[PDB]
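Can't attach files on this board, so I'm pasting raw text. These are the components:
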Amino acid sequence: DEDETTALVCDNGSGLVKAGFAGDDAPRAVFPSIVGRPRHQGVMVGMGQKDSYVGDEAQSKRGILTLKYPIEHGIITNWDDMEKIWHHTFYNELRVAPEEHPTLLTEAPLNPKANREKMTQIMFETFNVPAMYVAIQAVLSLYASGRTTGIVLDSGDGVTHNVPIYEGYALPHAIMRLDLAGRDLTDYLMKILTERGYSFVTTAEREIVRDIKEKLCYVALDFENEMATAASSSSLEKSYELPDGQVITIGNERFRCPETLFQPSFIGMESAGIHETTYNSIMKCDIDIRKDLYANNVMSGGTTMYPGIADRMQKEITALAPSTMKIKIIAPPERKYSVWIGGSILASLSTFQQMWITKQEYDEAGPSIVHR
Amino acid sequence: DEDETTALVCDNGSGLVKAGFAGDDAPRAVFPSIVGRPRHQGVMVGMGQKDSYVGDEAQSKRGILTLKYPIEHGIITNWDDMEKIWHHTFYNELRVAPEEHPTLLTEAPLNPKANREKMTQIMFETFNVPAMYVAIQAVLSLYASGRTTGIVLDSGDGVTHNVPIYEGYALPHAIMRLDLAGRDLTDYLMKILTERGYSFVTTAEREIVRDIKEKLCYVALDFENEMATAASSSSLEKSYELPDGQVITIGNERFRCPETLFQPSFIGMESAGIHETTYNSIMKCDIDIRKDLYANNVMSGGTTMYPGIADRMQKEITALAPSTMKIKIIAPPERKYSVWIGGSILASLSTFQQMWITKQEYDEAGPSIVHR
Amino acid sequence: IHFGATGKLASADIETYLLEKSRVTFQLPAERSYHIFYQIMSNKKPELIDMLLITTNPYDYHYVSEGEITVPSIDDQEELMATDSAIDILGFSADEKTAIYKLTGAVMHYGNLKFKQKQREEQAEPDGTEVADKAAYLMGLNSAELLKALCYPRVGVGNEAVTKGETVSEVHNSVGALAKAVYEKMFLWMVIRINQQLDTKQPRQYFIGVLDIAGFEIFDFNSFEQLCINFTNEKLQQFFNHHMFVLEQEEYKKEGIEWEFIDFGMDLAACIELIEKPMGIFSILEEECMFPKATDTSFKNKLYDEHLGKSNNFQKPKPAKGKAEAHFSLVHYAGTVDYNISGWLEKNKDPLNETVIGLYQKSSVKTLALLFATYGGEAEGGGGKKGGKKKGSSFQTVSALFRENLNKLMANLRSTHPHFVRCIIPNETKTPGAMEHELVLHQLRCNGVLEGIRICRKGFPSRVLYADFKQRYRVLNASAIPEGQFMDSKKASE
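---
Top answer:
Structure tokens for the assembled complex are below.
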């Protein structure tokens, strides 16, 4: 129990932090990855002067603060502001003292060696956690779907990745990163919806375009004769009621937004798209392992939640793969937390105890120890 | 029964080990003659750190290990790695304890005296077998075809040999060795098939060229007007479906690969070929024994299995031999295990008991005893 | 047993370890299941039979008549009351006392639950609502809802809840899993409830712990359960070896002898670390349990790659003798144990159909509802596919507790003055005044008896306790030895 209860799992994202206790089924804490700094001197009624704001209080009060994102494209870019988000996570969100909890953290696919050593330096030397561990994100997603070999298409708020994993070892030279994700996708909907003849003028109009994207957006299979369908004008249309009455209608654009993930050309991107990239990762891997990867395309991440994403991907890679092959696109329902759940499982596991980096290992080996 | 059941027969090859119990009709165990050594530190899920891998686990996991072949051209070149393959054979493959089983082993044609003494030293002193015996391979092949005088063309994975045998004694000065066999032959097909406009790019493409060679390759008689036939383009062609759909076609090259065994010039070899070598062995033997050898060309080995090998050889040596002679090319169906079967017969035999080298003979005479 | 300040009784405290869940569902040919079942069907309290909706013939309940049904030396009828009456004294509510019964019959019924293959489908479909009905009612459930959950287990892979279909073989097995699960829990509860009554307000100054557990037993077949027990014992042993080392050393200090020696426990630390330490067996065992697609085989390899050749107490089996297969041997103080790893992964996961548990969780039968609470409160933690059950308080290991409990125990054992008792079994044949040799010999090694003799003999074999020394030998210089023994229990012998 000492640490059975006690292991923490913190998944640091570009848009959201997911956090909680190893053992739980889902994150106890989910909140924006921002750190707000007040543009002016003054106070809220009853509070003192605050130097900084994190998560939702930074989002809610955004009009008087300069908002900053510590993680650009999955990589920690500002370490002063990240130690601020961690502090908030332990002390306010989970309300635990960190110096008696083992902490499993996550990093990104080709996270620079030096960063994995730096967050270890900050975990052990400024938070004084007993022990910690850094798992790679795609690797926890795979594992949370039971398996050990497969290829994960991972897509969240600032990055998309393909991480081919074989008997647990993520394959460095076959990993692909595509910098277009849910953030890019909300801003494109924004324009095709103002372009539908609308105005997201106040900040209460801006924010909810993102809630339109999440609730009403679709990834149609045969996106071709779906536009064609749009035109005959079926009961395909969908009206959403705004903060007030102002019933906005979205028929068609509803799927023009996730067609951006297959066609980056919709947004002036010259890069290849999700399905081709799944494939290219795969023809960059060893030959003998390619049947395995093809029958185990595990999807994880908030942006892979658009319904019919899996069917489109299913047919997208069948028709690029040699017919002798078995294609299989696994997309679980909890996928917006796969990464986290894979960490919860792993860290609560009976056999993981012997991989925890302890302060004994650290004080004796330097940050190098956990770096592997 | 004590040892009627109990005699083991282990045939050590350059590519495969064949093993089992004297008495059986075919080898209980057949597996690659490799010993893999992991290039990196780490584990498979649920297993411990393994220092070494042998047979199929070394082949399957080849991407993280450095593979090594203990037997180069039929001769044991690394004794540390061979004791590893034997260990695997007894304990894992046949799952027997060796210290209560007599073991018949095989060696190659002009196997150095010192080796036959060394594997005896390792059989008796590190495996503690009750008794053992080393038979020469061509000699077991002949005997498994009933006879005692004949000439064996023996061809496997790393060596080809001609071993003229007279009333059981293999004739040292007439034996010929040609270092081009099935291994060389798979790599040549490889090139004439990439040269047909193809790519065996991943390791799942590499391995199966060998399964193409085995299933679809032929030795045509009149290889001359078979190329000519290829050109008129008959229904001589043959398409194989790869691990996936990718239907590859092989019409012609199908026989250009075993024509390498008669023409070593196809592969930059200046040595003579199989049929000439059969013959030269024969005009190196005593005169009075040459009618016997000619009517008893026994074939054994995986690479002599190409259909129509016997007809080509039949006509190849008739037309080099004096017309007063009777030619006769025996090629049995089980020939990929002739050697082994000859050992199974011999070692289960009623009269062989008095040739077993026992630990009594050894502890008293030194390795010299079995060396003969 | 919590004694008071005066020295008079004040409280008690029970704790249970490793219950034979399998009996509930199985039984060897010469054996039988728990008594209760046979007690109840005895018919001393006929209402019970009708109340539970069963018969008096055990052959109607597969789960409980696979072995034997009657034992001559036992009067199921008498016990039933004993039992009954005990419940009461124990302060249980009639209702609870009703739950217990009703709940104990449901379990019988489950084993009667039958299923059949849906046509043209490989799915399981209920083969009748005869029994389900009873099981359902007895548990405060709904027949249907129950049979669905059972047949069409509605899971939650990803961030949702995915309805999964099961096979006939899968159901029969899941049922059995609940049957066992339920029984267990209940048993645990009863204990707690007991403990609850056994709780008084009066002050407590000290206690006397009485530990009853099994000893290191070696079988040709050693599975998971064996490891757990052996491990317990190898610990207990070290516990002694030390106490003795401590103890011994006092004498040589009291007397003034000059003898130096290392803790006798130390000899065993090797084996213990290998099991309980981080990269040790249990861990590798409990980690792999987190891998959604791991195999016993998988686990096995992980075990080796990491301990084989690198660890001395670790060894690859000797497959032949009286043993049944190969996986790994360990070198315990008592000897070498050949362990078979097959089922471990599972056994260790305690897989239970959560849909059903759901139903329990909202039963009309409070008690049943209760027993499940702790499962219902950790689900938060393992919301999506993959991951860690512990996040919400759910067990991650079959072994994760065992250890926790075994620690809480060995700790309680320390703040204690250990007093040892070794029970022996003369002859398998049940004959007074007789003894098979090798049979007793065995016990002696695994007992600790032979190890205590060893440690004694290191040396100075025979060691006399002072009073035991006075009495028997005073007579030798009668005047001067008696005076010595009487004048100072120790100084005397001197």
